[PDB]
Design a binder for this molecule. Structure first.
Ligand SMILES: O=C1CC(=O)NC(=O)N1
Ligand SMILES: O=C1CC(=O)NC(=O)N1
Ligand SMILES: O=C1CC(=O)NC(=O)N1
Ligand SMILES: O=C1CC(=O)NC(=O)N1
Ligand SMILES: [Mg+2]
Ligand SMILES: [Mg+2]
Ligand SMILES: [Mg+2]
Ligand SMILES: [Mg+2]
Lengths: 364, 364, 364, 364
């Protein structure tokens, strides 16, 4: 459990575009075998009917499939693909590629360094989504993912991404057939439930929330319950949960570090700057020391942002997650100077209500 | 031409809500007769089929109509109603009410103060929209509006709002019937043409662009041509142009001032802070010295923001103006601390391409 | 309780357009005092943030307000305004105006004729929506409405329209504040609950569903429970329920009749033709004997239409109610020859699941 | 040039789903080598940012790629993939697969039978789209496609599908760089231009429109100019045109036939029935003799359908093509009994203005 991690932010001209990656390989900058995870922003709506996420994975899988001489479906069990759709406003579509080599036992650098580990859960039944099963199964995956990562303590954990499923009418009907009712019948709303249960699963694992409180009823209801590390992204492309734990260990030799924080609301650029500061990035010229930023945005559920009304939860044309991503994307872009960042929407039990957790990865 | 101007930012719970205004009147803080202009943000889509703009005006007009014992349609000749739809992201719906009293005779301090004047053009034929007629007629209204305002020179001018029409299939068909073809047949696209010609009309009047270059062909085409003072907002509710000139004169006694600037792109929060700075506002606690901010946002027409791709002009679900408003709204909110600001979309010939002009109104 | 009913289908160029009505009055074809109800189709999205419904009412109210020398808010107590938003596909915006004069004493022919009666409920608390309170209060209004109408038995009842409220974040927060949780926190989804409870209220009153089964839990859950007469339309513009009972009595002298039926699914044009047939309308030239058609459309909740999959409940861009209205609008238009018909979306407990009740009003 | 054609309508559970096809192959019902064309309906928005079309092709290509041991990019030159996005209302996503074997010289049946041929054009420059180049290059491809098909005369031609490109900001910027201006700067609007020029290309080839009239200016302007055979579908996934000619020859031995017609407007179910009739399909039980229907829907550009107003061209939320597809989909479904049909939007120069051409493929 000793690793050297490489992280690459590569642009996408479209969801299917793998040329950023074909390049990294062909120019010898990364080994296909070493790749353990990919975190994408794709330009679908990031809601229920977003097939850009699936599509991106298909092409990536098939690309690595050629190189490793494996079936694409095989590569997907090997590598953690997490595609978050919805690139609104200035958000620029891209992949963030993660490669893991054995602790290049060259020399361990002085301070701790970036490490990363992954994990999968079993498939879920429709009636399990947004509920106990998903919460507890996720928590278990988080622990496996930390172990995989070689993360000593919760202190050293800085970011937990989770891809999770959602409900379609077919799934709902399937659940019904078994005499069980799904957590909701609104497909869009199911994403929040899936995200929220998953996030509480993380909160559980991180001992940020005590096991006794995590009843089904508290999911989406109890705003107070949350993980300040959790980033949840729902999707139609999968029936299981995919977990990526990211943090710091002394065993790691990466030329990279990670710090995290929390946005109090969608427009809290301050927090982000503050965290970027904490990594010793002090001018706009040092911003390119940042590989990427990962953030959670949501529409403040009380209907207000810093006292003023917002329309994001009343807008029947544009879903709130879309508003939120656009908003936070803009805020963060204004700080780091561009829109190629990972912003995901719907921060249910992820940091403060109306806010979300975020993380920064910079050169050591 | 000597005035005392009062400006009130009042929240709307909905487009028809006038209670913010009924209050101002009933608590003696403004006189219905003194009100000369209203600039609203309504929570429709701010595109073609936005009737929230019309509706807001109808109720405001009818409210002032009761108090002044006039027909609503009469009040609208008297008062300049400018309703910009589209309140995406954190943008909070509101009205900004302007009242003009003769120069409050008495003390009047050293240094210029806020003044304001209005003007209307004739109704336009469908085939005139986005074309010479609209450009020249607007320019003429701008001059009248400055005169009305008591604005000495272009130096003292800081902001020129213009409400303008747009094309519907009926209008298009009407134009066709007369053997003239409209500037476009895409209704959404017509808004840009109307906004753009109108903005060039302002550029003409402000001698920011020479008369010789302002050919029909250059409208939407020639990115280089622009006014750094122009804010254009198109709408289905009207067939003429409505102009509001805002600036500084020594003759005015307002307890208020105005400074302006330009955003280089949708995320240029810096410029805004800079301009806010220039009014002697430095801490977040002095931000409430700002009455309101007025800004123009657009999707960078070259398809990129600071080198990175954006999807705003490819998004067939959400129109670019909506993305842009959300984005700039967020940026500005992050600076002033909330979303109740005037952000309008589509900055064709309004400041830089991808950017727009903005203005701040603060306590003296 | 003996009436002569006149019904006028009038086109709208826009939501605020009252010229169709100003005409009817000025040309002596209807008396402002006689008008008892108006059923509109407005060109907003027909979802949560649709202010076209409110706006239409405001202008109608104010128009009749001038003529009756009443305040608009007074006219609204007097007249039942029901504005259904969402005019997708070929659906043409319009009002259907209902006028009631005492039984035109004189000749009156053999056979029943069209009659109509209205009713209002008290305002609802946010936490009452989609629940027992709303069900029982509606049922009570339905009875009063039949009485008003002079409708002898359930046999003679052919159509029950109900306008009902919906949930906004403010209302939700208000409910929360009182320690009660709202039926849902998804504003869009709340419309279905409001529509569904209201429809069951009608089913109760019509003895189509027994009182014992109408538990809170069964709302949106139990597809089997429904009224084949109920048409429910939710809206942000009101806090109470508005009921319009329509049917046949021997006491009435109207030159008009009404028959009803049910669509088995969104595309069941057959049923509609069948019902139109039953009124002795057989050629396309006799179609103008129809004053109007009123229909309920929904997206089949099982995710299929006649065995094939539909995407309406997965489409995060366009809400299902919008798909449904477009679909049924098209089907019905293909039969009657145009799109100026009343189609409302979301047929929860309104006729079959995936289907809805409809009614036709034709010349005697 | 003598062929036996097989046609298979296969359902898609999602855009990437190939299991319908894997089945056809594995159960020996079609040979991968014989497949010459695929016409899909995918569940994206069918507008600019629809990557469901590309994605569907990628997976199909890769599937046939395995079987033929070719690269996917190779298979795409071999096979004509035409993916039309947008499956609104009851429209059920699916592929229609076409396989061509040599005239199984068993015995030529009596009457003529279904034949089919394909063709490609060169890639287009951004500035060529919606213009002469695209018109003439398409016409040329149509002729090659007929030849390929073994179609004797224009009489024997019944349907010409064309996939064509569209404009993105990058393409527009690229064109600009060369000192040429694109046919429009609105990406959505570019689809209509691409579709329209392409359709006129077909009209040219079919001698339905004389060569002299086909000037650049007449594209989207001259409603009178049209092909009654043309079906155009624009897409972001390609830079060239893809043509599929379909018709009848005596040399063919297919167990299938094709007849075509034209819808006068979006709701003209009559025409469709009439054409279905003409193939000797007289009851609802014989409807399953239909393999598939292919239709073009558009929003009547004059803003009216059979005298009544429509909102499809004013709706800034939902694009007209989406309204149109939903509408015609519903109409056709009401006739054939379900929504698994090929309906494409935007019928510029394709049959009547407000209408479009359609075709039916049935068992002999
Ligand atoms: O931001 C996003 C997009 C997505 O794919 N699903 C989510 O729930 N979050
Ligand atoms: O911001 C804007 C731009 C416009 O043209 N008009 C609106 O209603 N909103
Ligand atoms: O058709 C409908 C359904 C509803 O609930 N209310 C509307 O405004 N439109
Ligand atoms: O119906 C459609 C969808 C698409 O892919 N592009 C079009 O122009 N037509
Ligand atoms: Mg949160
Ligand atoms: Mg500009
Ligand atoms: Mg129903
Ligand atoms: Mg046509």
């Amino acid at each position: 459990h000793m690793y050297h991690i490489d992280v690459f932010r590569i642009p996408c001209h479209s969801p299917g575009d793998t040329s950023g990656l074909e390049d990294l390989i062909e120019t010898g900058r990364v080994a296909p075998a070493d790749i353990v995870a990919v975190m994408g922003k794709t330009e679908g709506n990031g809601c229920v009917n977003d097939y850009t996420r699936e599509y991106a994975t298909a092409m990536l899988a098939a690309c690595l499939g050629r190189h490793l001489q494996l079936p694409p479906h095989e590569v997907e069990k090997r590598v953690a693909f997490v595609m978050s759709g919805g690139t609104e406003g200035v958000l620029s579509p891209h992949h963030t590629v993660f490669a893991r080599r054995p602790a290049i036992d060259a020399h361990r650098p002085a301070g701790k360094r970036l490490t990363l580990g992954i994990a999968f859960t079993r498939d879920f039944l429709p009636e399990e989504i947004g509920r106990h099963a998903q919460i507890t199964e996720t928590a278990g995956a988080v622990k496996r993912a930390m172990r995989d990562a070689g993360i000593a303590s919760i202190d050293d954990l800085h970011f937990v991404q989770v891809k999770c499923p959602l409900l379609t009418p077919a799934k709902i009907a399937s659940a019904r057939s078994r005499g069980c009712a799904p957590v909701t019948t609104d497909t869009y709303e199911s994403m929040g439930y899936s995200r929220g249960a998953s996030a509480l699963g993380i909160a559980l694992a991180t001992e940020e929330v005590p096991s006794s409180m995590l009843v089904d009823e508290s999911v989406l209801n109890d705003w107070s319950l949350s993980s300040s590390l959790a980033s949840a992204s729902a999707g139609i492309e999968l029936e299981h949960n995919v977990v990526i734990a990211i943090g710091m260990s002394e065993q790691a030799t990466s030329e990279l570090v990670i710090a995290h924080g929390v946005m109090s609301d969608a427009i809290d650029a301050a927090s982000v700057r503050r965290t970027i500061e904490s990594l010793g990035i002090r001018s706009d010229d040092e911003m390119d020391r940042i590989v990427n930023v990962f953030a959670k945005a949501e529409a403040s559920p009380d209907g207000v942002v810093r006292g003023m009304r917002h329309t994001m939860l009343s807008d029947s044309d544009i879903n709130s997650t879309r508003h939120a991503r656009a908003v936070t994307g803009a805020a963060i872009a204004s700080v780091v100077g561009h829109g190629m960042v990972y912003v995901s929407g719907g921060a249910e039990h992820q940091g403060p209500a109306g806010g979300g957790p975020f993380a920064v990865i910079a050169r050591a």
